[PDB]
Amino acid sequence: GSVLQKEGIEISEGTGYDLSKEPGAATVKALEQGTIVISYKTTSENAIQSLLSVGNGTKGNQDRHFHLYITNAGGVGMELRNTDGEFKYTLDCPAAVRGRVSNTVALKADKENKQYKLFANGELIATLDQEAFKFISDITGVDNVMLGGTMRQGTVAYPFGGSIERMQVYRDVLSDDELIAVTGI
Amino acid sequence: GSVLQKEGIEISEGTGYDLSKEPGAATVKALEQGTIVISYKTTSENAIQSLLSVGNGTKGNQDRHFHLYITNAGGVGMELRNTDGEFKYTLDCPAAVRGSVSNTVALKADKENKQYKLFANGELIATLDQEAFKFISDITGVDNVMLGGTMRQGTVAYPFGGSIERMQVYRDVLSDDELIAVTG
Ligand SMILES: CC(=O)N[C@H]1[C@H]([C@H](O)[C@H](O)CO)O[C@@](O[C@@H]2[C@@H](O)[C@H](O)O[C@H](CO)[C@@H]2O)(C(=O)O)C[C@@H]1O
Ligand SMILES: CC(=O)N[C@H]1[C@H]([C@H](O)[C@H](O)CO)O[C@@](O[C@@H]2[C@@H](O)[C@H](O)O[C@H](CO)[C@@H]2O)(C(=O)O)C[C@@H]1O
């Protein structure tokens, strides 16, 4: 099963929606691998909108976070960061989703294969293999989980507006076939 | 054989070294796929140092370029950009090289397989697959090739300092085994 799930969460641009106190959030804050699946509708023209983030929101730690994000040009991406000297692993895919319309995206991080895969609307859109595999448990001082933005020194960065229709986070690594199916209509 | 090669080029921080007029530069400016192999020594503490770039250096086109870069913290990466709405395909690998010392890195971009692979000092360090494969020929208005920085609105960005010991650009997609051997 999922370790954290939410449904029907509408977010006013800029505000975010804090998940840090939810049952399961502690698990999400320590993930060594796993899968994130999100259905959403954006109503914002912000250039970078985090759907889900997990990171360190404290002063001086603004480059220590993970987020799965969309853009105002129909892009989908993620960033996994613990300051640039430690790691900055990113995917950014163009023309993968559309903006008002429901989309479903997913990211998996697979420790055994050292691989990250991004899916949108029933398609695998990118794969990253890194010799030095990292995930959330490698970020230093993770203290929050949020929908619709990323906490950076107490400010909601990369603000989303619209609806998080469904969000599920898994410790399990779903198969590509599963993610093609679950991100479809 | 390479389509563009240079050896023994010193570059001070900020200066760059223009290759735009060299025979073969036109080919580099239009690559649909290929391989870049560079041996270098950095003397600079700049956080992002382009070893080789190919892009559009004109005003308002600062997000239209390709570069293969190293960092002050022993990292290696690349960015391939034509404005973020079009594409922004990147790799960034930590603790892959050392400043201390000569290092050799390589990037291949394989159109058939829609794949980019980065190598450093005899190891494959990252692989990127993109559904929408892009390379230099997809960048709009490419007008320069340089060593040791990236031209952005007439300024040398991401400035390298040190020596480009050997730089080769190929239209061919070299094998992983070839790259493991040449970089190690
Ligand atoms: C998702 C993404 O591309 N994020 C970038 C981020 C954004 O480009 C920016 O916040 C708004 O578009 O920029 C990051 O880098 C910044 C640097 O480019 C800038 O020189 O200095 C900034 C600090 O004032 C900041 O470090 C960022 O916000 O961390 C890098 C990130 O990948
Ligand atoms: C290799 C890399 O991370 N390149 C980044 C670049 C560098 O982080 C930065 O130039 C070094 O200081 O930052 C880029 O994004 C910038 C935005 O973060 C910033 O909000 O606005 C800047 C323009 O005034 C700039 O766009 C960049 O320089 O393009 C993104 C790039 O991937």
Give the domain CATH number at B19.
Answer: 2.60.120.200
Nearest partner of B158 among B74, B69, B77, judged by Cα: B69
Question: How far is it, in rounded angstroms, from Cα B176 to Cα A127?
Answer: 18
**Distance, CA B133 to ligand 2 centroid (Å)?**
22
**Distance, CA A73 to ligand 1 centroid (Å)?**
18
Ligand lying nearest the CA atom of residue B78: 2
The DSSP 8-state label assigned to residue A138 in this structure reads G
User: Hey, is B32 helix, strand or coil?
Assistant: coil
Q: Where are the beta strands (DSSP E) in B121-182?
A: 123-130, 144-147, 150-152, 155-157, 162-170
The torsion of the CA quartet A2, A68, A138, A157, rounded to 10 degrees, works out to -120
Q: Is the C-beta atom of B49 inside 6 A of ligand 2?
A: no
How long a stretch of residues is chain A? 185
User: Hey, is A9 helix, strand or coil?
Assistant: strand
Beta strands at A103-110 and A88-93: parallel, antiparallel or unpaired: unpaired
Instruction: Look at A92 and B89 and tell me if their CB atoms are within 8 Å.
Output: yes
Q: Is the C-beta atom of A48 inside 6 A of ligand 1?
A: yes
Give A87's contacts in chain B (Cβ within 8 Å): 92, 94
Nearest partner of A93 among A71, A111, A113, A115, judged by Cα: A71
Question: From the alpha carbon of B88, which atom of ligand 2 is closest?
Answer: 32
Instruction: Look at B85 and A93 and tell me if their CB atoms are within 8 Å.
Output: no
Contact between A125 and A117 under an 8 Å Cβ cutoff? The reply is: no
* Nearest-Cα residue of chain A relative to residue B82: A94
Distance of CA B182 to the CA centre of its chain: 16
Nearest partner of B77 among B56, B50, B104, judged by Cα: B50
**Distance, CA A110 to ligand 1 centroid (Å)?**
26
Interface contact B73, partner A, CB < 8 A: yes
Contact between A120 and A178 under an 8 Å Cβ cutoff? The reply is: no
Place of tokens 């679950």: A182
Method of structure determination: X-ray
Domain boundaries, position A60:
1-185
Residues in Cβ contact with A178 at an 8 Å cutoff, skipping those fewer than 6 apart: none
Question: How far is it, in rounded angstroms, from Cα A84 to Cα A76?
Answer: 21
Please count the structural domains in chain B: 1
Question: How far is it, in rounded angstroms, from Cα A102 to Cα A104?
Answer: 7
Resolution (A): 1.4
**Distance, CA B48 to ligand 2 centroid (Å)?**
10
How many CB pairs below 8 Å do chains A and B form together? 69
Q: Count other Cβ atoms within 10 Å, centred on residue B146.
A: 24
CA distance B71 to chain A (A): 8
CA distance B125 to chain A (A): 5
Q: Is the C-beta atom of B78 inside 6 A of ligand 2?
A: no
Question: How far is it, in rounded angstroms, from Cα A140 to Cα A42?
Answer: 30
CA distance B145 to chain A (A): 25
Instruction: Look at A130 and B125 and tell me if their CB atoms are within 8 Å.
Output: yes
